[PDB]
Structure formats: C-alpha cells, structure tokens
C-alpha cells in the first residue's frame, strides 16, 4: 500500500491536554501524512475515511451540569477556515455526586484537498482517560 | 469481484452466556484467506487492515452494584503469542426498566501474516446477542 494513512494515539505523558503521537507500536503516520501543530496534514487531493475515539472518565458528578464534545474539523489550505465534519455531545451526569466512563466514536468519508488540515478536539481535557492505551485515537486512510 | 481479505462475523444467537463469533450466516463474511480459529480472526497476509467491532449490553434493571462494561480488540503476534490492546472503551451502565449500552471500536493497523485478532467483553451475561446486527466483528485489507 502507497496510500496516505495515519493512526495517531493520545500522548499519555501530557496533562489536561489531548496531544496526538506516532509510536511505532500499533500507530501509523505514513505515505505522506504529516503531524503538525497537533493536526493531520493531507499530502494529496482525494477521498479519505476519517475516524477518532475519546474516552472520558470522571470520579463523581459535579454540581455543574457537564456536556462533553468530540469534533473532527477540517482547516482549508486557502483561507485557514475550520468546519465541523463529525461531532457528538454526551451528558455523563443527571444529578450531583463511583467513577463514570463515556466513549465517543466518530467516522466518515470526505473529499479533502492537498494541505487541508484535520483536528480532533474535545471540551474537557481534564476528564480524558488517555492513561491506558487504545482508548483515544485519530486516523485517516485515503480510499 | 474483490480479492481483498475481508470478514464480518456476528455473535451466535444460540450460544449462551459467551460471545461466540459466527461467519456461516446471511449478511456475514469470511473470505480472501481470513480464518475463524479458536474464536479469533487470522490475518492471511501482511499489510494495513481496518478493524471494527460493536457490542450491545442490556439489563432488566440498573445493577445493584457499580458494574463497568468493556469491549476490546486485541492483537496476538504470530510468534511469542503476545496479546496487545489495539482498541477499547469502558462504559458505566446506568447507576424494573431495561437499560442498553452499545460500544463501537474501529481503526487502521499494520498486521503481520498469522497475527490473530480477538474481540472480547467482560459481562457476557449482559451481552444482547439474540437480535441481528447488535454484535459484530470485522476486518478488511486496505
């Protein structure tokens, strides 16, 4: 295979932030895909399957209603405009105060242009379970 | 036709209190060299594979205890039989009305030939396998 491909995983050594990594261990960044400014960079024009998972974990429900979001966004080369491709929201708690887990999975096919950039971002980095491996990832493959 | 290795195996509805993958069904696949051996999918050639699996858990009333549900796809290396986590999530079931928790996993992984993939859960007693298309496990070569 000579197709642009990336499967980047959360950095376990960061604190309250989602940083993407290319380990050699069951992670990929190959055939022209670059990781720059925490965004995946598309080397050529075409169809790409784009996907990502985050896992939120909280010890107990806080007094303030929590909403969690995960978004895959496209930054266009021409203007640096940023559009939402894939997004979801979860409400982990309905009453105050016993750990809770919330996964969100995103995936889809999209026409992208060479130099278009992709970000996978969340609202609550402080609730992200990236300690264990395989729970937080972000990938593309040219089709 | 296509000659890309592919599988889409589905939970046996007649199995009991365990997750058993089946291929000999309508709207299921196992072809171009992929084998179903010891409840695990066997990679017939080296390369990039897209791997995905979904499970649905169900209970008749919120658990009396703090249950955690997990779903995992693991890679067993051809030699050294080392089992590494590729993809996983954990769900908090609701803290008698029925409850439902789906988990979806997928992504792209470079595999060596004879590598095996397992898709496993922790509470088969909560796994809803009676209904079609709630519990599946697939790979395709890219």
């Amino acid at each position, epitope marked *: 295979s000579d197709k642009p491909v990336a499967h980047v995983v959360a950095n376990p050594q960061a604190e309250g932030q989602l940083q993407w990594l290319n380990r050699r261990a069951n992670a990929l960044l190959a055939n022209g895909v670059e990781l720059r400014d925490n965004q995946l960079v598309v080397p050529s024009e075409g169809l790409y399957l784009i996907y990502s998972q985050v896992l939120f974990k909280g010890q107990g429900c806080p007094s303030t209603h929590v909403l969690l979001t995960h978004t895959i966004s496209r930054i266009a080369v021409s203007y640096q405009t940023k559009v939402n491709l894939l997004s979801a929201i979860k409400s982990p708690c309905q009453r105050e105060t016993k750990p809770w887990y919330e996964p969100i999975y995103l995936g889809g096919v999209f026409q992208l242009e060479k130099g278009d950039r992709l970000s996978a971002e969340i609202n609550r980095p402080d609730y992200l379970d990236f300690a264990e491996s395989g729970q937080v990832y972000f990938g593309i493959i040219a089709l | 036709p296509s000659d890309k290795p592919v599988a889409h195996v589905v939970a046996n509805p007649q199995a009991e209190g365990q997750l058993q993958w089946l291929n000999r069904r309508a709207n299921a696949l196992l072809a171009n060299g992929v084998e179903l051996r010891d409840n695990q999918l066997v990679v017939p050639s080296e390369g990039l594979y897209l791997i995905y699996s979904q499970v649905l858990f169900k209970g008749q009333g919120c658990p009396s205890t703090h249950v955690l549900l997990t779903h*995992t796809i693991s890679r067993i290396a051809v030699s050294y039989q*080392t089992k*590494v*986590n590729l993809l*996983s999530a954990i769900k908090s079931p609701c803290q008698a009305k029925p409850w439902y928790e789906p988990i979806y996993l997928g992504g792209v992984f470079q595999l060596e030939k004879g590598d095996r993939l397992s898709a496993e859960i922790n509470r088969p007693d909560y796994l809803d396998f009676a209904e079609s298309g709630q519990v599946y496990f697939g790979i395709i070569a890219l």
Partner: nanobody
Framework: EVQLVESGGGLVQPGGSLRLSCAAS????????MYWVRQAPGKGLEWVSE????????KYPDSVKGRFTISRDNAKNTLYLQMNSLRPEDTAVYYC????????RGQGTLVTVSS
C-alpha cells in the same frame, strides 16, 4: 530488556492461601494482556490466569477456577495472583509472562503444598 521478577512463593498446607506478586519493566505494561503460568514436576507448562489491559476481563482453566484470582495495578506495573484453598497438585514454580507459553517469564516463585 523486558524483565518480570516474581515473588511471594512459600510452603503452605492444603487449604492455605498465598499472594504471588510480579514486578514488570522494559515494556508498556498497560498495552499487554498478562498471564500467570506454572511448571509442576514432570508436567508441561500450564497457564493458570489471563487478564486484559484494564483488568476487567479475566480467564482461568477449570484446574484453578474458583480458587485463583488474577489482578493488576497499571500505576505500579505489578501483577498479582490470589491463590485460595490451595491443593498439593498446585505445587509448582509460578511465573508471570506475556503469553500462555510463558514468554518473558522470570526466575519464578516456588509454591509447595504438603501436609
């Protein structure tokens, strides 16, 4: 450079309890399912426990089921085997490993069960 050192082996009488420990280093402990295996006199190597990365999936052969409990602490890179109501036929060198064939097993810890 993977290294597993086992401990907590000793002599116990039938119906006794033992806690084996396993200290890991040289790999991403959190990435790997882990095993307890054992080697008895004149017998083939026998896996006695399997645990997944988050510790929520455990598997046992019928030989030790009900009596052996595998657990892990990812923070501590440590694997445990709680052995309850131990029988003579459990007497063997115990190893933690990254496979049920006993890959990367250490020096082992000896568990002797005699009246």
């Amino acid at each position: 450079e993977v290294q597993l050192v086992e401990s907590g082996g000793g002599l116990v009488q039938p119906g006794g309890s033992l806690r084996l420990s396993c200290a890991a280093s040289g790999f991403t402990f959190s990435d790997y399912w882990m095993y307890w295996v054992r080697q008895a006199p004149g017998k083939g190597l026998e896996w006695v426990s399997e645990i997944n990365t988050n510790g929520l999936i455990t598997k046992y052969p019928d030989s030790v089921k009900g009596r052996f409990t595998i657990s892990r602490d990812n923070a501590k890179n440590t694997l445990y085997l709680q052995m309850n109501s131990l029988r003579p036929e459990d007497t063997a060198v115990y190893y933690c490993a990254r496979s049920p064939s006993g890959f990367n097993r250490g020096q082992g810890t000896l568990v002797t069960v005699s009246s």
